Amino acid sequence: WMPAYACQRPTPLTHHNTGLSEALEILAEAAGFEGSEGRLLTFCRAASVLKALPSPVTTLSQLQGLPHFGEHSSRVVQELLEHGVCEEVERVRRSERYQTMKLFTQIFGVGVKTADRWYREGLRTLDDLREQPQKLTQQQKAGLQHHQDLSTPVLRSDVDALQQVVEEAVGQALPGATVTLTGGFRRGKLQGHDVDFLITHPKEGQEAGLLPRVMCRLQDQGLILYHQHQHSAFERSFCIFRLPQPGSWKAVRVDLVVAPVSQFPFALLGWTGSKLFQRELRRFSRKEKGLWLNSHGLFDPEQKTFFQAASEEDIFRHLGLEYLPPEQRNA
Numbered sequence: 171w172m173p174a175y176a177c178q179r180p181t182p183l184t185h186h187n188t189g190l191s192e193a194l195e196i197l198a199e200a201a202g203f204e205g206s207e208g209r210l211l212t213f214c215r216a217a218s219v220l221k222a223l224p225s226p227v228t229t230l231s232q233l234q235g236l237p238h239f240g241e242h243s244s245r246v247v248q249e250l251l252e253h254g255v256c257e258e259v260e261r262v263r264r265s266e267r268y269q270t271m272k273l274f275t276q277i278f279g280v281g282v283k284t285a286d287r288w289y290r291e292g293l294r295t296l297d298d299l300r301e302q303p304q305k306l307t308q309q310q311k312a313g314l315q316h317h318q319d320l321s322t323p324v325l326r327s328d329v330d331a332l333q334q335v336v337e338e339a340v341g342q343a344l345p346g347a348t349v350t351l352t353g354g355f356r357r358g359k360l361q362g363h364d365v366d367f368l369i370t371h372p373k374e375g376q377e378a379g380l381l382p383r384v385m386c387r388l389q390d391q392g393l394i395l396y397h398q399h400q401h402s403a404f405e406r407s408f409c410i411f412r413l414p415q416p417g418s419w420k421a422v423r424v425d426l427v428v429a430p431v432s433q434f435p436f437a438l439l440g441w442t443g444s445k446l447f448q449r450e451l452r453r454f455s456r457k458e459k460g461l462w463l464n465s466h467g468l469f470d471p472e473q474k475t476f477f478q479a480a481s482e483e484d485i486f487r488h489l490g491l492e493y494l495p496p497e498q499r500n501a
């Protein structure tokens with residue numbers, strides 16, 4: 171048997187069922203595009219189960235005794251095994267609605283609601299968006315300006331270069347301040363859509379005003395194409411960096427988040443993901459332990475108390491879970 175919650179089982183980076191999980195994730199994504207959140211979660215859960223299996227699923231008999239594998243997810247896997255293709259998945263892939271929603275939602279600063287509105291208004295292509303600049307936020311304009319580079323997978327080599335310039339700027343702005351790589355790259359991914367950094371300082375409060383100083387330093391070096399700073403809850407800057415490369419350059423999305431050191435373990439846990447892993451962890455916390463977990467803390471609503479954590483391990487322990495390092499959180 172395999173545990174029900176993704177936070178109770180290791181999910182490694184590489185697995186034996188990538189065709190099957192990809193097909194179920196197409197159905198999940200399509201469901202999200204239609205506002206069908208229940209169905210999204212159900213397909214995401216089923217895909218996540220296949221990622222945790224130790225062996226390839228070669229026959230339908232292998233599905234026995236697995237949680238979150240309802241009739242619909244089973245039929246999809248059955249059609250793939252028997253016929254090499256699932257007609258429902260291929261129809262989604264080929265549909266203009268899905269292709270356009272994928273196109274729009276991929277753009278920096280565009281969510282499902284915005285993409286759906288644009289679809290309903292007859293917009294289909296990136297050129298259609300550029301013909302209607304009054305419909306775009308500044309963030310979305312920047313996303314369109316750099317859309318080719320931003321739909322080029324970010325590589326580990328890009329991350330290492332970016333972490334060096336961010337660490338240099340952070341270290342020059344404030345000695346003692348630290349930079350931690352989070353997101354999918356912390357989980358061991360070889361590529362990604364962006365780079366996530368979490369910034370703090372060991373003395374509570376010394377992190378105040380640090381981010382704008384970091385940003386000034388980076389902007390002075392020609393490294394910033396776009397930056398949106400927001401105070402609100404963590405201070406963060408959603409950016410597009412201009413990454414120099416041999417003979418050229420490429421735009422790369424980078425999120426910089428500042429957390430006070432008291433909240434750092436919660437922020438690190440939340441920001442490391444995966445998105446599904448953290449969804450499952452918060453659900454586990456609430457339903458199984460009566461506690462409310464977020465990126466800032468772990469709250470007992472009965473006692474009106476906050477858990478003091480020094481580490482991610484403290485949080486797992488406090489919730490009665492065996493610790494999973496980041497590379498086993500790839501749910």
Ligand SMILES: Nc1ccn([C@H]2C[C@H](O)[C@@H](COP(=O)(O)OP(=O)(O)OP(=O)(O)O)O2)c(=O)n1
Binds near residue numbers: 366442443
């Ligand atoms: N709706 C969201 C969005 C984000 N996150 C958390 C989990 C993610 O791991 C982390 C960083 O978000 P990203 O969108 O950068 O996701 P990843 O870095 O995990 O994936 P990618 O490789 O696509 O960047 O923030 C979350 O829990 N829920």
Ligand SMILES: [Mg+2]
Binds near residue numbers: 362363
């Ligand atoms: Mg990321």
